Amino acid sequence: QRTPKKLCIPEKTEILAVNVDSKGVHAVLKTGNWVRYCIFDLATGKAEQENNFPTSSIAFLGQNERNVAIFTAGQESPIILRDGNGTIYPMAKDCMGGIRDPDWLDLPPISSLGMGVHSLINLPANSTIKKKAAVIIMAVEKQTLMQHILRCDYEACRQYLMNLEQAVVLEQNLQMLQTFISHRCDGNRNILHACVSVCFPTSNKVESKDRKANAHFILKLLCDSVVLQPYLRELLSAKDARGMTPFMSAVSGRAYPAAITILETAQKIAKAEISSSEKEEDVFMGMVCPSGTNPDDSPLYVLCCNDTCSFTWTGAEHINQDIFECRTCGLLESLCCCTECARVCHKGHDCKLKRTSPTAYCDCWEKCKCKTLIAGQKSARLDLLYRLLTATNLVTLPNSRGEHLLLFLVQTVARQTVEHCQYRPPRIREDSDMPDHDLEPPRFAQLALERVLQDWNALKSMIMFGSQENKDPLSASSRIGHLLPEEQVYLNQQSGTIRLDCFTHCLIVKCTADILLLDTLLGTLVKELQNKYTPGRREEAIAVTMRFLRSVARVFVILSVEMASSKKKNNFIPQPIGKCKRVFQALLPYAVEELCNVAESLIVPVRMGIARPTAPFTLASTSIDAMQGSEELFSVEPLPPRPSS
């Protein structure tokens, strides 16, 4: 091809870095805020394979846009990619053919990356050893405090901070201080991110425990350092490659003491900050859960969904449990991951549920890196839950599936009661890489549900879910502003109770193991009904109680209709209808009124002659059959909105 020929690229797309290998020509392209990775074949002349980065585009672009680079020898060598901040972005291919969720190498930025193809010779008798190799030479920058943190040296960090404060007293180190604040590692991570990363647990209970203790000491030193007080506000508000502030990274990585330290430091900073058109909440939520984050990265939801892998108690023996298949990691055709692994390990992958689920066990360890094998500290987890409940308003926000935190917790408890009865305790009666599997099944869902039900704001948000104020993304009535006003009137007249009906059904008829959850909910409702000092609390409590009682009445009516009142054995009640009766008795003056309204609703068509014809049906003689039918009726999802427009 004596004449140069064009390579087709999309319009209005900037090229960041290009290099050429045997496979074709590799490039990184940016349009707007969308950074991709393309490989063109010369014969095709167009974009043969284009891939999207799993990490965020803003993090990849970094502070400087001209540091992006691609390195390849040219004939047979891998691609080394270098992002905007100057560090190295790992590349790998999943089973579908995209860029895997990178495992950060903690390498500091590389100033120069030499790479060469070198043919190995003098091989004895032409052995099986490969004849050629790539020699990679690297020039890595000398970031003092970043490496000090990553190496977990308390003394080094203390000395560096003392020298820094002495220089600040000398008032001659402003530029270097600003430069140090701008230091980064892989994943657009600042110093606090490094402290959090080294604070992560490694195994269940330089020594690893000593390393963790030094990491906690370093994090506390950074938090309480006098010099870095004006700079902690920006560091705690900085987002890494996954859009996580240091607190969010701490929660996700199960470094709960670190998360508590960061949260109290954030509250301290928010209290001591100027009010120049900035509120306390707007400056605290900016560093706890910044606006724009997806609901599945909310610290409270991540805290509740961290749990532990099902393999950690089931062992290698099959157990009847819900099974998820992931397309990206390759967990297909008898390779299955548990419901705990579908919420953390595969958060973002093309993971779905296997409807036809035989007895199975989780093998997430043999297909991908499992972050659910190690469980953190229970007391710190509960304390962080308490503080996030009493400090922010995160519990009001739902998650990506449109369900409130209370609904998610109740469903988790209902599923766990069924699954954990299969637990085989460690009876005293070749595989070395198999994960440790001698720990109890998680018991955090029950405690979390009990504590959240005690919260008035959380219960108010859950019971009033689907009302005029509270709305979930997965509802056709969420966005209706683009419709005709006549249709908007009809869509705004009605209120949402599908989520509340699911909540009540899973709390009364599915959470059969325990009764204290319903008692907790009733206690909170009663406390707020009888509250008088707080203005307007009684009326709000009355409204919440009426809505909850209507939901309970619906569940009770459906259950009673399904069942048949057999005189034999004089049972007189199933367990769920007993729970509904307990709710009615505890809130009698309002329960009777709501029952009157429900009865009128049921009887009006009969006495107006407009009943809709229905085929006869038999009545269940057992509660196990009555639970079904009601399960199909209540455990349903609202109608999703119309995609796009």
> Three-class SS string for 356-367?
CCCCECCCHHHC
User: CB-wise, 44 or 585, nearer to another protein?
Assistant: 585
Q: Which is nearer to another protein, 374 or 558 (CB)?
A: 558
Is 309 assigned to a binding site? yes
d(CA 129, CA 364): 33
The answer to whether 152 is a known ligand-binding residue is no
- Considering beta carbons, is residue 8 or 489 the nearer one to another protein? 489
The answer on whether 351 is annotated among ligand-binding residues is no
Residue 364, annotated as binding a ligand: yes
Binding mask 407-446 for another protein (x = CB under 8 A): ----------------------------------------
Give the nearer residue to Zn ion in terms of CB position, either 338 or 563.
Answer: 338
Binding-residue pattern over the window 466 to 495 for another protein, x denoting contact by CB under 8 A: x--------xxx--x--xx-xxxxxx-xxx
CB of 433 to Zn ion, least distance (A): 15
* Alpha carbon separation from 514 to 245, 422, 450, 506, 553 (Å, rounded): 37, 18, 11, 12, 20
Least CB distance from residue 312 to Zn ion, whole Å? Answer: 8
Task: Report the Cα 285 to chain-centroid distance in Å.
Answer: 17
Q: Is 289 part of any known ligand binding site?
A: no
The answer to whether 370 is a known ligand-binding residue is yes
Sole binder of another protein in the list 91, 134, 335, 598 (CB under 8 A): 598
- Choose the binding region for another protein from 25-33, 64-72, 145-153, 591-599 (rule: CB under 8 A): 591-599
Residue 561: exposure state from Cβ atoms within 10 A (0-12, 13-18, ≥19): middle
Span of 15-23, 29-37, 347-355, 577-585 interacting with another protein by CB under 8 A: 577-585
List the structure tokens of 34.
């969308």
Q: Mention every residue, 6+ apart, whose C-beta is less than 8 A from residue 285.
A: 291, 392
3-state secondary structure 145-195: HHHHHHCCCHHHHHHHHHHHHHHHHHCCCHHHHHHHHCCCECCCECHHHHH
Measured from the CB atom, is 111 or 622 closer to another protein?
Answer: 622
Binding another protein (rule: CB under 8 A), the pick from 210, 234, 282, 593 is 593
496 binds another protein (CB under 8 A): yes
Residue 571 binds what, of Zn ion, another protein, none (CB under 5 to 8 Å, by partner type)? none
567 binds another protein, rule: CB under 8 A = no
Question: Which one of another protein, Zn ion, none is in contact with 603 (Cβ closer than 5 to 8 A by kind)?
Answer: another protein
Number of residues that bind another protein (CB under 8 A): 81
**Cα 264 versus chain centre, distance:** 22
DSSP designation for 513: S
515 touches another protein (CB under 8 A): no
Which secondary structure element, helix H or strand E, spans residue 373, and what is its range?
none
3-state helix/strand/coil string of 266-312 = HHHHHHCCCCCCCCHHHHHHHHHCCCCCCHHHCHHHHHHHCCCCCHH
Local structure of residue 436 (DSSP, 8 states): P
The residues in 535-564 that bind another protein, with binding defined as CB under 8 A, are 550, 553-554, 556-558, 560-562
Chain breaks in the chain (C to N over 2.5 A) after: 205, 429
Annotated binding site for Zn(2+): 309, 326, 329, 338, 341, 345-346, 349, 362, 364, 370
Annotated binding site: 309, 326, 329, 338, 341, 345-346, 349, 362, 364, 370
